[model samples]
Target: NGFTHEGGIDVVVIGAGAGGLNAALVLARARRRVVLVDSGAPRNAPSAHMQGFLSRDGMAPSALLETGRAEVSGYGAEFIRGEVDDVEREGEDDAPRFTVRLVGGVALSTRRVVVATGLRDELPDIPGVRERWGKDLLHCPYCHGYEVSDQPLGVLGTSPGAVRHALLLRQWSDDVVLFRHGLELTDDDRRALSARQVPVIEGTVKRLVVEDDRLRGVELAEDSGVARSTVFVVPRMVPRDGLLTALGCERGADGWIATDRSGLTSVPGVWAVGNVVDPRALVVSSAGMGSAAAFALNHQLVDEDVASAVRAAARTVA
Candidate 1:
């Protein structure tokens, strides 16, 4: 609708996660015309409470987003709950501009763009895991470790890194069980698990047993099941970089878009942060990236203004 109706927006931040919100807030505070568009699909939406953020620890994911949106809006940054279809580059190469089109028919024209759409987590195909995600089934110990500390923890052996993950979870509890879902580990892996006192259970994971609407344990093909009140898994993280790819942004061999320390992409006038750029980035780190990118973007805009004023002054002298 009227979200980005204003003329000459300085920046259009896509993906209203921690990175996008913070980026918009910084730009708005600098008196820059900023419009942030989000499809409202945050990767951490499943997690009830987010931790590890110094001030916002244990806060609900939605609450943090609400507060961030309000803070950015208070500074006059336009917020739109819509999806961006694609971004098109316009104007000359020397004085470039961008047109961000939303699926809802609102087109935002801006000088710079920041992508923070985050990523999608692809859980295992086992039954009941998806249903219990973010609840009894969890990931990222730093995010949910303390909450489930000392509880019966189960780490599924799905990837090559599963043994390492199980060993890492030993700090949270004494009874850490590693489920070997047909994954073979090296001799070093065996020694590590033994040293950590983590028991490895073999067999395919048939399903998760739920009792009283809570995860009781993980069911296997052989035995009855393993008693685990909480389960940890490594979901495949896929970044939401469709817009960046569409805009012809460069990507490294790893398939992630190449960006500098401040989240500036290979494509000029465009930047990316959050899980979209780094799947390992936590909430607090994403916000810090947004703020850093905002500072660089504002200075770039200022440089353009200075050039424009200098050109006008030269014309007057002539």
Candidate 2:
């Protein structure tokens, strides 16, 4: 979707989620021209309500986006509902800039780019898992554990770290069980579970048991099943870093884009925050990251303005 309103913007936020919205809010309030280009797809769209965010706990995820947009728009931040396909550097080295192009030929030029595109969770290809996602099937104990607390909780074993995830879930419920779904359990893993009073169920999970449109339990092989009211799984987090990678940002040792605390990428005039960089960051943490990045970017812009003014004055003297 392309709509022409304004061309020049100080910063372009690639995603309108928590991170991008917070960044746009900070910049726009500072009187800096900002634009947020959103693809209208959010990571938490599957979730009915978000938790762990103070004051906004139990709030619908969409409501947070709405509130943030209104707050930022009041300060003159523009928004575009479009998907970005490509972004590249332009202009000379003395004054480099970026040009962000959307899917339908919408182009915007800006001095800096903040990528808060977030990430996608690749859940297991198990049956019934996708169907109940964000409702009875969940992830992140801190995000959904309390809501399902003291009930029959089931932790699906997918990765090694999921063992720790199961242990963490014990804080919320006493009736927690770990389902060994094709994951080989180590001796230490068994020891930890036994010590924590968490029982282990051995079975290749055949599928999830849904009775009367509610998650009843996890059906196992051999016609056995364990009843559980809530299921927690650890889905692999994959960052949406296509724009940053296309822009030649350096990678970390783990192949993720390396950025400082303020979200400054190796490529100058470009920054990244939120799940796009940190898979472990919570929603509130991502907002804080965006705000921190905004301050740093504004300071950088101020320095550039002062230097340009000095150069113009010297040219006049000569």
Candidate 3:
């Protein structure tokens, strides 16, 4: 029967973002004992709504979590708001159970750990960017481009992939400008951008010009040129891999967690999901990964659970 699940909780998932919460939904629905630790910190918290998520599209990022929490809780999963300060293997076993320590000193134990802490985006040091982050100065054309269509759009050109981003943004508008205010644009980069018919602006942006609490345009350091009403740029994505590093997780050259198609990290019984594993994943893709990892881990644990129960039952008969 479902006696194994009644034995105790088997998994401890960290972070209550879309990925974390969705993963909890899976484990709980499958009759596994599970707990989700949400620090209440999500990368998209600054954004008013998330995009490209089917059915939940255009919903406030928080609204999605609110509903996910209720659904998962309906299945007996526990949700708590706290930061995980550290995690380590309990004792020394092959399928190492992780003992997670919360900041408040409450420690939770789980046979497997799914880290979906996601990453933070550090936008270029443009004036007014921090002020307008997730509002008018947006990133991810797929997430905010449609809302800004047909406006005078500007792309901050500090990241290495500026040229590629320029081309992508061009899909949403005709009057797009690539502002290389503080980026190294090679002749080839300029050529590629020009070949795409994307205009280029070279200057340090002074600030974002806002009117009536909406984006109006961007001002230049020299105050010579007027502003563009809409802007999107690639903020440096910094994955919260400190925990991964502590666990000896494999990392790629770019410092992201190395994961295969199944979101399996180098460490057994340890997996990564969401932005921490893939920098380019949108909200939907990240949530999907969390769900996938949940399935992958559930099967893995089920085998152990079945064998343990069989041993116990055999001893009782003997």
Candidate 4:
């Protein structure tokens, strides 16, 4: 009688990350028939704890998600533990409809859809980098820099943004070095590093050195090891927007799925939030994005409901 009926759901949230979970929480609390589908894969799952999430800072990422799931379920939001295969739209532009197809042959019919499937971080193909990921081989400075502050740090020059990343990491540690791993540095880049007193090591990084389950140093192709407590590498941020692309959503100049300030995509009845749209959104900001999307989506639903009611009343009068 609720979410099981065809075309009965108000919102179908795909991916139960922080963004999707918070979105489901707000929608369910508003008494909307919300169904959240997830594959149980989160970008932060590898990390032991998530930082910069206010009161939930330093809390286990899994624990935060567990609590969020419980809170969302308490509000009658249905949870589907599966992967979404695709999403198809139907009906007129004003009265749009969606069919969320899952991998296991289940389909959900809903009035609106929220895509919170966050992006994937493609790390450099370096030895020990993947093994030490989320532990010592980190990415965002704001997320993990505080714990490793004031230590010897190295930034692997893997991408064009590595120089800027190193500059940002300098705030957390004075002894910062840039490992020139096949990245061509400009004259300005050299000047900036020199000005900041951040030395640029000229060599290709062979791999990261690990000892006793902790990152100890960086190994260069020249068979020399530099002692550093922590190392950061710029990962290629690839957004998981296959469903959005299949649904004909537009992309921004940055090439990610485009969304308005409230997370609404160009297509009606579809919204995307969090890392799928903004790669820089941390745990707290992603949750905030979810809340903003919920507010806008609810208002849109209200408009549709009022129009439907008015149309029914006019038919009766006629």
Candidate 5:
């Protein structure tokens, strides 16, 4: 019933992750015609539980999405289980229109769009790193550190921030070690590690050793395997922002799509939130971003509606 005169929906949220689902939920509750498209693939699918989200901490990641979908659907937001192949604008800036095309030949016309497509974590080429990801091999100390606290923890030197990552992880465990797997450590870095009591393992990491379906240790090329219970490595985060970029959204200095505080992109009627814009956004923060975007979107729509109504009244009077 909130559809425009051109029969276009009010909002089309791409990706049913925390950000998109929450956006759809708020927009639907505001009585805006909303459609949410999901590709069935989530960035945290490998993670068993998600943390830092108050009141829902330690809940299974899948369960959170399932509940979110149900909640959004209860408010009349439609769901499409498919990938969005492309997004293209059609109308002028004052009255913007977009066509969201799915992979299976389905296209939707929408007045506004929200891109919540999250980023992907590119892990190292180690043999067992991929196999044990989100388990004992983790990246975020805030996400998984308490479970393995006070244990032997190792940090893989794969990225430029590996030294800093190791130092940060040291806060969680006193027995943290930095595995110098080809990462050139500066003198300052070594001094910091030494001061922090984080030992530096001078060898290349061949692979991770797993036993009993759990991470056992980090195996080196020449030395014996280190008896570590968990290892942390900084993954190269690549955002799935093709839709935003294709729509000609401006990118920031970090090469990711730039957006305002309310998630509005350079292109009118388009918003990007969550990891698509900020890689550091956790689950709770993403949901908050979605809510903020929904408020801004609804305000814009109200302004347009009032303008159209004024024009209609003037034409009638004339």
Candidate 6:
């Protein structure tokens, strides 16, 4: 469920997560009269804390949102706490002004739209995996790998198209294992992992073992146990919301918004940046994308302002 607006806004950025806030940061700094509408449903709320955020490493994801909102407010940007019901281009201005309607009975007109809502991932069905997600068991080697590096780590290749999960996780540690529970690894896949010293554990994971409230390893259905400090899994990543679809944004071949180099969607004056455009992007990458989108919007609007000024002056000459 999303929102809609009328007579509208200069810019409307949806979702107040990392990417949304980062874009708001730039827009606010430029004093562009921006509005950031957030459903307040972050995908990382289940995570105890986040890693790989550089100086803000090990910080709570919620805290990061809070700090970013305050920073944006310091620059006089506005924020709305409601779901976006729908958004679409209206009239024949040719600049594509969006009319947004919110679930809270508020409507705004926006010259630009940024769809920054992220995604939600399904955790392994194994015991304790979903419950302990982001706490002990984790995903994203760049985010949680270093914390458990050098310790034995493992993966369950249950989801489709996830051989990369095993290979990429190897970067954080020399010791890694891929529990090929169901997927078939080709000959080349086996050789590649062997060369890197990552083992292949072919067994059905009966459950994830927890010791002292910490992830210890995975237990096989055959009663055999494999010990590891952490386990990587490939869960189906679902879009945070269908708001991009509501805006008439085109989906890529792999599905998701097909944004331009500056986060402009298939529709003019509307953009979808951050994870909505690239699901593989981490916090650093998402933030960078939002910043790029903000700069691009400002550049386009600046040209419009200059043209308006020139027109006003030319009328004086007439």
* Alpha carbon lDDT at 52, candidate 3: 91
Model 3 C-alpha lDDT per residue in residues 111-156, reported as the tens digit of each score: 8888989998988776778888888888888888888887788887
Which one wins by lDDT: 1 or 3? 1
Cα lDDT tens digits for candidate 4, 48-133: 98888889879998999999999999998889898898899999889899988888688878999999999999999999988998
In order of TM-score, best first, we have 4, 5, 2, 1, 3, 6
TM-score for each of the candidates: 0.95, 0.95, 0.92, 0.97, 0.96, 0.88
The regions of model 1 sitting more than 4 angstroms off are 1-7, 315-318
Q: Is candidate 4 or candidate 6 better by TM-score?
A: 4
Choose the strongest candidate by lDDT.
4
Q: Per-residue lDDT tens digits of candidate 6, residues 81-166?
A: 88888886875444567877888667787788888988878776788787678776777777777778787888887786557787
Query: Top model by TM-score, which number?
Result: 4
| lDDT to native, each model | 0.88, 0.90, 0.82, 0.92, 0.91, 0.80
For candidate 3, what is the lDDT? 0.82
Error of 2 at 124 (Å): 0.5
lDDT of 2 by residue, 1-318 (tens): 333345468899999899999999999987888989999988888888998888999899999999999999999898889899999999765576988899889888888899999999889888998999988898888888878879999999987778898899999999999998878888999999999999988878888899898999998888898889999999988899999998899999987899998999988889999999999889999999999999999998898889999999999976
Off by over 4 Å in 2: 1-7, 92-94
How many residue pairs clash per model?
Answer: 0, 0, 2, 0, 0, 19
Instruction: Give per-residue lDDT, candidate 5, residue 63.
Output: 97
Ranking by lDDT: 4, 5, 2, 1, 3, 6
